[PDB]
GROMACS .gro file of C-alpha atoms in nm:
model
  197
    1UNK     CA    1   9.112   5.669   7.566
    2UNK     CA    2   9.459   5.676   7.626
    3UNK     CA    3   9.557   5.978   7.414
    4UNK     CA    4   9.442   6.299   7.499
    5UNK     CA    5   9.549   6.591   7.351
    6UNK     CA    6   9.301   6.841   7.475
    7UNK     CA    7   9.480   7.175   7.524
    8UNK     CA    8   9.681   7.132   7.167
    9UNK     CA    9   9.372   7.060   6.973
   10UNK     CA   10   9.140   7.307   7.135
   11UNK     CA   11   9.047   7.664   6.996
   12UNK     CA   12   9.189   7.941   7.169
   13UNK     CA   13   8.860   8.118   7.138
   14UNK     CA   14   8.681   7.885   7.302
   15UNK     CA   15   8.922   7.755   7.619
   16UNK     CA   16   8.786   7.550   7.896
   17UNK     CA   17   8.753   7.699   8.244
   18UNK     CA   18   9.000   7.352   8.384
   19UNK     CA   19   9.299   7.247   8.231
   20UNK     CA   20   9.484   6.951   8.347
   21UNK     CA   21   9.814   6.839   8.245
   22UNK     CA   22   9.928   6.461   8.345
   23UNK     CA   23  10.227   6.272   8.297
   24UNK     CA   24  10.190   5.874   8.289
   25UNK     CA   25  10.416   5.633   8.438
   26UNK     CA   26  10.733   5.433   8.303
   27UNK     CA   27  10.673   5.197   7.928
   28UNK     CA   28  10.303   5.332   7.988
   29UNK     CA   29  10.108   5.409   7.647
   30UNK     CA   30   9.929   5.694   7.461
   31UNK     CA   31   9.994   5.978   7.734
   32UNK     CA   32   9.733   5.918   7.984
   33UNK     CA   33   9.858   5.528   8.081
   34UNK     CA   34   9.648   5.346   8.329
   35UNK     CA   35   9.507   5.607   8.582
   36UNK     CA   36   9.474   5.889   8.342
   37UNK     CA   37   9.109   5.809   8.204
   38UNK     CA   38   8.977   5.690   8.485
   39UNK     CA   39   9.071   6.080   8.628
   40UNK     CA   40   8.985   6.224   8.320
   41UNK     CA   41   8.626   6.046   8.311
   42UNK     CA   42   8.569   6.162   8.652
   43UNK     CA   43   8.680   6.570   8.548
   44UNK     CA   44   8.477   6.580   8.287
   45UNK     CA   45   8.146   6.466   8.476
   46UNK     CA   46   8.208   6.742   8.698
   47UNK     CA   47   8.314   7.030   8.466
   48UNK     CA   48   8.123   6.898   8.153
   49UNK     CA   49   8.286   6.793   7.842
   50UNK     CA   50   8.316   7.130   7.765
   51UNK     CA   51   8.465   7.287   8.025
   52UNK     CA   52   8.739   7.083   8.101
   53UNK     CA   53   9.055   7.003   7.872
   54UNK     CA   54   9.244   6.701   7.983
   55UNK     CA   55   9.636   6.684   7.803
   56UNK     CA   56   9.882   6.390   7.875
   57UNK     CA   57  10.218   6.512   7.849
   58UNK     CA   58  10.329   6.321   7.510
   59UNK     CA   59  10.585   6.451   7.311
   60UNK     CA   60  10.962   6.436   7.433
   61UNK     CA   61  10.837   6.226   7.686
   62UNK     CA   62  10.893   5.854   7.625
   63UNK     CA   63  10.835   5.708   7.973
   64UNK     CA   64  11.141   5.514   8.030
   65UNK     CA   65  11.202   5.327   8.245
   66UNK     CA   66  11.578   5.380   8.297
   67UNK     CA   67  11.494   5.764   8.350
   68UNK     CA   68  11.423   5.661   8.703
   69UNK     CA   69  11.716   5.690   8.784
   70UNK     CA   70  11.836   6.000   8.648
   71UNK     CA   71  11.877   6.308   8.921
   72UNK     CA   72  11.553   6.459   8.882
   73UNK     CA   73  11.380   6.085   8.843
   74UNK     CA   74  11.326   6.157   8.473
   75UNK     CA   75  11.526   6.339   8.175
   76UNK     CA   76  11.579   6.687   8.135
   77UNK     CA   77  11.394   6.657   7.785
   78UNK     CA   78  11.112   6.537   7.982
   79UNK     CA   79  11.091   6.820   8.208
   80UNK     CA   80  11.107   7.034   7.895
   81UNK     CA   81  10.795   6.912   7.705
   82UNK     CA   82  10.585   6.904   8.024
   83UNK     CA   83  10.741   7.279   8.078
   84UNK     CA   84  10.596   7.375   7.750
   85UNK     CA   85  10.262   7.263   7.774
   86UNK     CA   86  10.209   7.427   8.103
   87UNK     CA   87  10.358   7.702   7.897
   88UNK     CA   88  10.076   7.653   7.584
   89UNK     CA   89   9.829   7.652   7.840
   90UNK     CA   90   9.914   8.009   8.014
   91UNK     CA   91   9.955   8.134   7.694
   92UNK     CA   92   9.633   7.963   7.514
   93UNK     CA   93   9.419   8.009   7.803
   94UNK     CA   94   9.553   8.240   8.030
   95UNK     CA   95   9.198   8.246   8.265
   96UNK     CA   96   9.188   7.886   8.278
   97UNK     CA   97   9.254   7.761   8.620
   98UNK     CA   98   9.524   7.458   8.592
   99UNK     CA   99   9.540   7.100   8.802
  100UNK     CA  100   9.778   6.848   8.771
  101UNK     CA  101   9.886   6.469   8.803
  102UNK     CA  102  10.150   6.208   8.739
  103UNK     CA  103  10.202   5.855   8.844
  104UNK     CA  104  10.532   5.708   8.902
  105UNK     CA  105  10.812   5.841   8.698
  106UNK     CA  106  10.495   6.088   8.540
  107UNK     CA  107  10.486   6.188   8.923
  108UNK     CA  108  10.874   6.274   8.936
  109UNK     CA  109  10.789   6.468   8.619
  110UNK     CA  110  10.530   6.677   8.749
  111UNK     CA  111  10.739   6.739   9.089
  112UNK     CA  112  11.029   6.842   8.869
  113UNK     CA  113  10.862   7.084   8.595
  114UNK     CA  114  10.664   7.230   8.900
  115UNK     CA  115  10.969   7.321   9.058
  116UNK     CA  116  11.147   7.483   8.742
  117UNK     CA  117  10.817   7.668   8.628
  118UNK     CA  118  10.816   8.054   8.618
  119UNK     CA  119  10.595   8.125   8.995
  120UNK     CA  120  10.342   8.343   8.789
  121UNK     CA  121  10.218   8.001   8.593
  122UNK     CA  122  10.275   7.754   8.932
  123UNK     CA  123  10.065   7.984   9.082
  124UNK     CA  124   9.755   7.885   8.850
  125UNK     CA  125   9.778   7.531   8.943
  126UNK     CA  126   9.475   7.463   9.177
  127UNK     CA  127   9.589   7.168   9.301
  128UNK     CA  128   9.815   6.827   9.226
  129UNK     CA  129   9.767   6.454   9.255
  130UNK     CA  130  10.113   6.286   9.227
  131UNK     CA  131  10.078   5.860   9.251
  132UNK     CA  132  10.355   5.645   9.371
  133UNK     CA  133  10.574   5.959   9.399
  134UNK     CA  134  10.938   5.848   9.289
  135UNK     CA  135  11.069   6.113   9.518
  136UNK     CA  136  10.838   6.037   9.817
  137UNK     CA  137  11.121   6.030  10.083
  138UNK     CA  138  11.368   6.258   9.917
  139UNK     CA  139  11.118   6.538   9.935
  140UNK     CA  140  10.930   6.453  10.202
  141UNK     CA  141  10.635   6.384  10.039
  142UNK     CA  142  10.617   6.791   9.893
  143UNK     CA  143  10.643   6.937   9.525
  144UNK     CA  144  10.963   7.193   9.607
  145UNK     CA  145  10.841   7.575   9.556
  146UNK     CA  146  10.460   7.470   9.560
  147UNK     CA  147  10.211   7.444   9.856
  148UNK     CA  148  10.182   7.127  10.076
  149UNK     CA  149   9.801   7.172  10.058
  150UNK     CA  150   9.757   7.200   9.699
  151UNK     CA  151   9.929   6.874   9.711
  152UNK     CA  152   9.793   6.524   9.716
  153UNK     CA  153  10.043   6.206   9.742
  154UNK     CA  154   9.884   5.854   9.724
  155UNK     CA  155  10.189   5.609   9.821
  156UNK     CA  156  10.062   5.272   9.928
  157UNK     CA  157  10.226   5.112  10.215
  158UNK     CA  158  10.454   4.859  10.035
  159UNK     CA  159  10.530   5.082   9.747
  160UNK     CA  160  10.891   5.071   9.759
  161UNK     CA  161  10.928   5.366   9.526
  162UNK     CA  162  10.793   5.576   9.782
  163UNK     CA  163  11.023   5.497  10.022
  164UNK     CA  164  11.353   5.574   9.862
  165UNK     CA  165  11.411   5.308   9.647
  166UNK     CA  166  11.356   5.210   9.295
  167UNK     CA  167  11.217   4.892   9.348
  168UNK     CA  168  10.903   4.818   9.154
  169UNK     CA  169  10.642   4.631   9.400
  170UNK     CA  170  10.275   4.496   9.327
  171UNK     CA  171  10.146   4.772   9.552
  172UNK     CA  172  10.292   5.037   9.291
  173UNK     CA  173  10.005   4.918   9.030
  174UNK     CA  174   9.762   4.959   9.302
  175UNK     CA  175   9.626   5.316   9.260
  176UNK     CA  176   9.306   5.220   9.076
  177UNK     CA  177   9.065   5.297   9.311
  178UNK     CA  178   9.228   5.615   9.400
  179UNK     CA  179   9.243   5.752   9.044
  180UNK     CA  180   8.862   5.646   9.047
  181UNK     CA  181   8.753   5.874   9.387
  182UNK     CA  182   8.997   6.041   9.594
  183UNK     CA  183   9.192   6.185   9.322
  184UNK     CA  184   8.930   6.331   9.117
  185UNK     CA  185   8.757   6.425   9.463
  186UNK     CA  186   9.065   6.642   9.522
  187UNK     CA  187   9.092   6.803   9.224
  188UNK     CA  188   8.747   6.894   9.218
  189UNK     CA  189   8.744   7.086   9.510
  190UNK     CA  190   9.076   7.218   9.479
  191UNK     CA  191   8.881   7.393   9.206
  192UNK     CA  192   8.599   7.447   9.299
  193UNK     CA  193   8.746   7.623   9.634
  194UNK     CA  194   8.917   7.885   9.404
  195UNK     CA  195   8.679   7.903   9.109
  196UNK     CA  196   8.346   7.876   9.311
  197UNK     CA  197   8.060   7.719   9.163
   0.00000   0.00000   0.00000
């Protein structure tokens, strides 16, 4: 449901071919949130139960909402857990191919710990789906250090996060549908355009 803790649970000797690693948004719960299972759902249709391991970033990560506002859009103990589980997963499952996702502040996350991760590791991630991107307009709608087209953004037009502020809109909880098709469509292919069929 909410809680997924795939890639910690899971036996080493028996790793899943897709990893993905997603950070919720602000006073969300579990680690997945809202849009999490509905991508998750979607992953494991295509990859089979088995071959896919979907991991929320828990942990350090407490999804608050004041962390908005901090320089990177989230705390530096934030960036840290997600850090380390990209870290588990390299080291757990090091032929794994990895994908990746956040929503709101979880999308900040994911832009930051992209940035700070060792090249070798950013390098395995297929592709990322990043939903109301804090950092939209500050970044020009790109994860710093990682290709613009392994990179998805879904901003709705009236998302004021996405636009340099931090005002929270009704059109920021309005990414249903696109956790439901588009996202998981991207991911897929991503994917499968590295991994083959």
């Amino acid at each position: 449901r909410t809680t997924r803790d795939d890639l910690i649970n899971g036996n080493s000797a028996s790793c899943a071919d897709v990893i993905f690693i997603y950070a919720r948004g602000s006073t969300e719960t579990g680690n997945l949130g809202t849009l999490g299972p509905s991508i998750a759902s979607n992953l494991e249709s295509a990859f089979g139960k088995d071959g896919v391991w979907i991991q929320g970033v828990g942990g350090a990560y407490r999804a608050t909402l004041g962390d908005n506002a901090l320089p990177r859009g989230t705390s530096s103990a934030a960036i840290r857990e997600m850090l380390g589980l990209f870290q588990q997963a390299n080291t757990k499952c090091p032929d794994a191919t990895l994908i990746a996702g956040g929503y709101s502040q979880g999308a900040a996350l994911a832009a930051a710990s992209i940035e700070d991760l060792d090249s070798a590791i950013r390098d395995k991630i297929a592709g990322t789906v990043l939903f109301g991107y804090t950092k939209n307009l500050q970044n020009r709608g790109r994860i710093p250090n990682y290709p613009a087209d392994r990179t998805k953004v879904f901003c709705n037009t009236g998302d004021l996060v996405c636009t340099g502020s931090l005002i929270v809109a009704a059109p920021h909880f309005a990414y249903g549908p696109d956790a439901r098709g588009p996202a998981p469509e991207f991911l897929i292919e991503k994917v499968r355009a590295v991994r083959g069929s």
